[PDB]
Structures are given as structure tokens and as C-alpha cells.
């Protein structure tokens, strides 16, 4: 049960490093999308090779 609570700490740890913390969540998801879709394109091209 606490593993889902321990996991959000590491996400909170990801908020501090690379300065996601005070980043106005209107803008955070914009960076989250640019975080996902580049890694989402890293998989689809990586499975080719």
C-alpha cells in the first residue's frame, strides 16, 4: 500500500531536480507531454533497430 506512496515521493523527487516544482501546472503538463512523446518516440524507433 505504501509502495504507491513511496513512488509519489520519487516523483516528488523528480519535481525538485530539473526544477519542475514551481513551474505552474498549467505549464508542467506541457513539459510532461514533451517528456512523454520524445520517450514515446524513443521506443517506436528503438524497436525497429
Amino acid at each position: 500500500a505504501r509502495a504507491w506512496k513511496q513512488m509519489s515521493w520519487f516523483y516528488y523527487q523528480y519535481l525538485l531536480v530539473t526544477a519542475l516544482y514551481m513551474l505552474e501546472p498549467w505549464e508542467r503538463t506541457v513539459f510532461n507531454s514533451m517528456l512523454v512523446s520524445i520517450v514515446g518516440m524513443a521506443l517506436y524507433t528503438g524497436y525497429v533497430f
Partner: protein
């Protein structure tokens, strides 16, 4: 304060990995070819190093020198103007290495010669030390 910003610790190491991220981002694109990845990343790098060194002038903060370098772009104001320093030469060697790997890749083509030279040209031309304060009809 923009005079010790490239004279800091590990800024050289972090400058590489930004480009190293930028290539691996540009490497994982579907409808692209492995020559024009290198063609793209030598264009974008030399675009950034012109706009972030030779175009924007002043400081993002407020200078207590009453705005002495208000009319001076960021390259001109490094290390209080002394040119042949330990860190300007690192900033000149690095696009040449980015010229030679993009010389190695694309297999020495003619259009990849033309497009990847004038980016490397227009970045070193302002880095002539005798082109310290001369500005071509503007800025």
C-alpha cells in the same frame, strides 16, 4: 553574472550533454534519414550559438555597473573582454568538431557541404577578435 558563467565548474561538461541529448532526440525521428540528422544538428547548434552569444545584449538580471554592457552582446562581455581566455577557445573548437562529424556523416555531399558550412561560417566570423565591436548596419 555573465562574466563568470562559462568560467564556472562543469558548464563545459553540461554543454556537451545538451547537444548529446539534442542528437538522440533528433536520432529518434521516424521520417528522417541518418545523414540529415547530422545536417539538422549542425544547423540548430550554430543557430543557438549565434542567438545566445552574438544577438542578445545585456543581462537578464540588473547590472550594478549602471548598464555598461547594455550595448554589448554576450560573447563580447565574457571575462571582461579579454579574448584569448581558457573558455572562449573551448567555444570555438566545439563547432569545428561538430563540423567534422557532420563532415564524416552525410558522406561529403555537395548540398551537405553548402548548408553545413555557412552555419559554421556565420558563427566563427563574429568570433574574430578584431571584430569586437563592429556591428553590420544594425543591432
Amino acid at each position: 553574472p555573465n562574466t563568470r558563467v562559462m568560467n564556472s565548474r562543469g558548464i563545459w561538461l553540461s554543454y556537451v550533454l545538451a547537444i548529446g541529448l539534442l542528437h538522440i532526440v533528433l536520432l529518434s525521428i521516424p521520417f528522417v534519414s541518418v545523414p540529415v540528422v547530422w545536417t539538422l544538428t549542425n544547423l540548430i547548434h550554430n543557430m543557438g550559438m549565434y542567438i545566445f552569444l552574438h544577438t542578445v545584449k545585456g543581462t537578464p538580471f540588473e547590472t550594478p555597473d549602471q548598464g555598461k554592457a547594455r550595448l554589448l552582446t554576450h560573447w563580447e562581455q565574457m571575462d571582461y573582454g579579454v579574448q584569448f581566455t581558457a573558455s572562449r577557445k573551448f567555444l570555438t573548437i566545439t563547432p569545428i568538431v561538430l563540423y567534422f562529424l557532420t563532415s564524416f556523416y552525410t558522406k561529403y555531399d555537395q548540398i551537405h557541404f553548402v548548408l553545413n558550412t555557412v552555419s559554421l561560417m556565420s558563427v566563427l566570423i563574429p568570433k574574430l577578435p578584431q571584430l569586437h565591436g563592429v556591428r553590420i548596419f544594425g543591432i
